[PDB]
C-alpha cells in the first residue's frame, strides 16, 4: 500500500537487552567475579 511517502523509503535477540547492558559491563561475567573475593 503506497501511502504517498513510504514507497520512496527467539534466536539470539531477546537477550539483546542483557547484552547491550553487558557490552562494556562485566564482559566476562565471572572471571573477575569469581576472583573478587581475594581482592579484599
Amino acid at each position: 500500500m503506497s501511502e504517498k511517502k513510504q514507497p520512496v523509503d527467539e534466536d539470539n535477540w531477546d537477550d539483546d537487552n542483557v547484552e547491550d547492558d553487558f557490552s562494556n559491563q562485566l564482559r566476562a561475567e565471572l572471571e573477575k567475579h569469581g576472583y573478587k573475593m581475594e581482592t579484599s
Binding site: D15, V18, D21, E29, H33
Partner: protein, 378 residues
C-alpha cells in the same frame, strides 16, 4: 546407535568455542570416525578443523566398507522382492538405510525416509524416523526438520499408551526450548525426571538431572522449589551424588549467601563447555543473581550494603553498581543510597498499579475495539 554420535555433537560444541586443544579433533574424532561408520563427521569437519594430514586413505577403506554395505543394499532392493512377502523391499532397505542415516547426515535420511514412511503400520515406524531426524537436528541445529517431525508426532503419535516414546517427545521439546530461550517448558516437561531411565539424550542420566535442576532453579517458585528439589526424595539421590549442585540448592533454600557466588561460579564454569547453553551462559548469571536478590530484598526494609558486603565477601561498590544495573533493568526496586546508605524496599503492586493494569489493557485493547467499531462505516 546414537550415544557416541551425540558425543560427536558434544565434540562439535567442545571444539566449537575453545582452541585449548587442537588435537581432540584427531584423538576422539578419529576414534569416532573409525566407529559407527562416521563418514560425514569428518567430511564436514575436514574444512573447519586442521589440514587433516593425509586423511583420505584410512578413510578410503571405510568409505569402501560403506560402499560394500551400499552395494549389498542395491542388490537387496531386488533380492527382497523375490522374497514372496509383504514390503520386504521396504524392510530390508529401511534397516540398512536408517543405518545410512547413521553413516551420513542428510543423504541416507532423504533417500530412506520418504520410502520407509510410505506405509505406517505402527507409530514406531514413524517415530524411529522422527528420532533419526532428531539426532541430526541436535547435530545441526535445524528448525524445520526437528519441529515438523514433532508436528508429525503431534499428528498421529498421540495414540497408543506406550508412554516411553511419548515422554521422549516431552524431553525433546524440553531440549529444544532449553536449546533456545526456555523458562518454563523444560521444567514442565522435565518433570519426568525419574520416569525415563534410558535414552541416547540420556547418555548421562545424571546430566539430565543437571539439566532439570538448571531449569528448575529458574522456573520454580520457592514453595514449588522445596516441594520439587527438597521434597523430591526420588530426585534426591541423583542430586545427592552431585555435591556442588546440591550445595547450591540447599544453600539457596537455606539462604547461605557467601557460598552463592562460589556455587554460581561452579555452575557457570560448567555452563561454559556444555552445549545448547551459548544463548544462556550470560543470561543465566544475572538471572540467578536477581533470583537470589528477590528474597534478599524480601528480607528487610532496613538494610545496608555493609551487611551485604560481609554477607557476600566483597560487595560494596561491586554490588552498588550491580544493583544499580538491576534497578536500571526495571526489576528489583530498592533505594540504594549514599552515606545514609539504607537500602529501602517497597510494598507490592497493589497500590494503584493493580488499578492501572486494567486500563493498561484497555488502552490498546480498547483501541482494538475503537478501530474495529470504525471498521463498519468505513
Amino acid at each position: 546407535p546414537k550415544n557416541p554420535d551425540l558425543r560427536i555433537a558434544q565434540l562439535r560444541f567442545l571444539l566449537s568455542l575453545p582452541e585449548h586443544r587442537g588435537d581432540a579433533a584427531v584423538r576422539d574424532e578419529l576414534m569416532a570416525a573409525v566407529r559407527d561408520n562416521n563418514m560425514a563427521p569428518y567430511y564436514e569437519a575436514l574444512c573447519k578443523s586442521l589440514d587433516w594430514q593425509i586423511d583420505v586413505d584410512l578413510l578410503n577403506k571405510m568409505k569402501k566398507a560403506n560402499e560394500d554395505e551400499l552395494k549389498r543394499l542395491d542388490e537387496e532392493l531386488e533380492d527382497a522382492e523375490k522374497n514372496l512377502g509383504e514390503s520386504e523391499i521396504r524392510d530390508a532397505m529401511m534397516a540398512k538405510a536408517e543405518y545410512l542415516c547413521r553413516i551420513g547426515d542428510k543423504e541416507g535420511a532423504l533417500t530412506a525416509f520418504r520410502k520407509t514412511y510410505d506405509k505406517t503400520v505402527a507409530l514406531g515406524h514413524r517415530l524411529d524416523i522422527v528420532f533419526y531426524l532428531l539426532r541430526i537436528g541436535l547435530f545441526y541445529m535445524d528448525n524445520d526438520l526437528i519441529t515438523r517431525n514433532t508436528e508429525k508426532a503431534k499428528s498421529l503419535i498421540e495414540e497408543g499408551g506406550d508412554w516411553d516414546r511419548r515422554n521422549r517427545l516431552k524431553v525433546y521439546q524440553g531440549l529444544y526450548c532449553v536449546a533456545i530461550r526456555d523458562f518454563k517448558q523444560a521444567a514442565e516437561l522435565f518433570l519426568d525426571t525419574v520416569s525415563t531411565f534410558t535414552s541416547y539424550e540420556l547418555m548421562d542420566y545424571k546430566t539430565f538431572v543437571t539439566y532439570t535442576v538448571y531449569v528448575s532453579m529458574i522456573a520454580l517458585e520457592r514453595p514449588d522449589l522445596r516441594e520439587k528439589v527438597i521434597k523430591g526424595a526420588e530426585i534426591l539421590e541423583v542430586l545427592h551424588s552431585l555435591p556442588a549442585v546440591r550445595q547450591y540448592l540447599f544453600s539457596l533454600y537455606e539462604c547461605r549467601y557467601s557460598v552463592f557466588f562460589q556455587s554460581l561460579a561452579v555452575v557457570e564454569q560448567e555452563m561454559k563447555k556444555d552445549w545448547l547453553f551459548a544463548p544462556h551462559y550470560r543470561y543465566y548469571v544475572r538471572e540467578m543473581r536477581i533470583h537470589a536478590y528477590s528474597q534478599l530484598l524480601e528480607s528487610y526494609r532496613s538494610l545496608t550494603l555493609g551487611y551485604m558486603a560481609e554477607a557476600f565477601g566483597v560487595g560494596v561498590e561491586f554490588i552498588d553498581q550491580e544493583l544499580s544495573r538491576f534497578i536500571a533493568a526495571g526489576r528489583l526496586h530498592c533505594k540504594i543510597d549514599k552515606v545514609n546508605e539504607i537500602v529501602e524496599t517497597n510494598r507490592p503492586d497493589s497500590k494503584n498499579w493493580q488499578y492501572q493494569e486494567t486500563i493498561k489493557k484497555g488502552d490498546l485493547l480498547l483501541n482494538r475495539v475503537q478501530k474495529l467499531s470504525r471498521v463498519i462505516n468505513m
